[PDB]
Subunit: 328 residues, 2 copies
């Protein structure tokens, strides 16, 4: 009965921030966890040190610890996978250079999940490019359906809640119905046209130029802004984003943002074949449902074409440098 | 009614790990917190970035945020102070060099607490040398009693619980009555002669040479071991140590380890005038009580003389480089 939860790139800043929250029992309440920790050989020494810290925390909620560089051992029997680790974008690197390196990582992990993980596993891809990476993993796992998969857009989601909370001078508990559409970055759509605040609708309380201009642009650049100030990745906020994304994913929910494989229904004319972020509700059985009947203005719609265009374009590059054919 | 909680050195690794736990509501449950964050001018840019992350977490439990380099603004009205920040030991530095630099920091903060903080504030000193630093702060605050003060030994405490948990193959919830005596490091006494495990006493289940030799020496060197592996300070485990130390300090408790000003009672012949770590119970009113009637063997007692000797010696050096007289 204890739940097996995997974190890749576990000795890094994001993984390190997430391990201890999960281990404390923040993700699964009073249910004991068997924490799975994966690192590349360069990180095994640091991972070991992280594991030492975990013991030094003395969490009763921790049933066990699997820490390894072997993916069969790391991915075996897990119910939740936080695919945090990835190949970081470096200087002089094309997107196709990025997609090539991450493609190899996530085709391996996609199949690792498929063979070793539970058929009922929930995979949250965090490593960039999340959406396209998640698509690589999904395409490597023939046994797994698409309910198993999700890329994270919850950080930009909470960045919206937090920012709107502070604008209205209200606690974040009283901002509802925000969402991110599309890709996790570059073209993510900060949609504030359904949002409310404790209760008047955010839309007819703040200017359209603000919400769909300055505000939107702040969301898009928030990640880099934090990095510039701290000189480090948005570790704690992201780890919180991923934890709560999976929290709701497991136990239900207004609505939240999740980058999921586009359903056969193809809501809002978003073409199937990419990992696309939607405003979604989640049932208490952990079933994700896209919020289907919304009024999108010419800004939101035009922003959707921009982000889907990027997703489809990026996946086309992934197939290109992965040497893939139609039936792949 | 929201509680004002201060963290010094807030943009550092320990402070950063602690801010988000406190903000989530881990320390004070469902009570809203007003997080106070202090940094030196070199850290104000990073602190600002940390504060950005905090917004991006969207914690409803967070009532407000004071982040500053001004100590009057940082220390005003606070109920809990995590004195994390300090002057780090560098190469070519004497202990008197260390005590000189930290002396200035903590005499300022000791008086900052005195003037600006609540009279009922609880101060947990984390920055090295914790015990002696706490004594500097205490000696600068004439209005404050000694119930206001504590240095942290909870990390080595939990390092014992965690290590004994794993040895007996039991969850850490089922190890009781361990304690650290004396100074927070160098001469801390890992006392396992009252310890139990779910129920036989740890003492008559593991060898005396182990518990009071190899085991003791592992505790003493655990901090450095973690650092050597991770290439970084034991951030998460410490932040957890401090949070739970204050947790119990506020809401009560077997017993825990706390470095407190030696009571007038002078338990175990430990002379008053230092900040000494004891096995303590804590009442539900947050009143700390030293566990007074214990059987100490010749190892424990000899280890107490060694650690008190260090505390008294270190405080004598602090007075020396602070240019202090008898009435100080």
């Amino acid at each position: 009965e204890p739940i097996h939860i995997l974190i890749t790139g576990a000795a890094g800043q994001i993984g390190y921030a997430l391990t201890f929250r999960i281990a404390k029992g923040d993700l699964c309440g009073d249910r004991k966890v068997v924490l799975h920790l994966l690192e590349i050989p360069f990180g095994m020494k640091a991972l070991e040190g992280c594991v030492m810290e975990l013991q030094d925390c003395a969490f009763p909620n921790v049933a066990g610890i699997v820490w390894t560089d072997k993916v069969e051992e790391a991915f075996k029997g897990v119910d939740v996978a936080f695919l945090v680790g990835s190949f970081p974008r470096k200087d002089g690197m094309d997107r196709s250079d990025l997609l090539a390196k991450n493609g190899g990582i996530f085709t391996v992990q996609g199949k690792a999940l498929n063979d070793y993980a539970k058929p009922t596993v929930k995979v949250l891809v965090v490593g960039n490019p999340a959406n396209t990476n998640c698509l690589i993993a999904q395409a490597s796992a023939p046994k797994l359906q698409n309910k198993n998969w999700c890329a994270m857009t919850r950080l930009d989601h909470n960045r919206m809640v937090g920012a709107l909370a502070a604008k209205f001078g209200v606690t974040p508990e009283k901002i509802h119905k925000v969402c991110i559409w599309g890709n996790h970055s570059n073209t993510q759509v900060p949609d504030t046209t359904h949002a409310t605040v404790d209760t008047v609708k955010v839309a007819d309380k703040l200017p359209k130029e603000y919400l769909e201009g300055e505000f939107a642009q702040m969301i898009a650049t928030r990640g880099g802004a934090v990095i510039k100030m701290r000189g480090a990745s948005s570790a704690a906020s992201a780890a919180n984003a991923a934890l709560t994304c999976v929290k709701d994913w497991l136990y239900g929910t207004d609505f939240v943002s999740m980058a999921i494989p586009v359903p056969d229904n193809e809501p809002y004319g978003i073409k199937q074949g990419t990992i696309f972020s939607f405003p979604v509700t989640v049932s208490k059985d952990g079933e994700v449902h896209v919020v289907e009947g919304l009024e999108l203005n010419d800004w939101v719609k035009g922003r959707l074409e921009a982000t889907e265009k990027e997703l489809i374009g990026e996946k086309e590059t992934a197939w290109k440098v992965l040497g893939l054919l139609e039936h792949h």
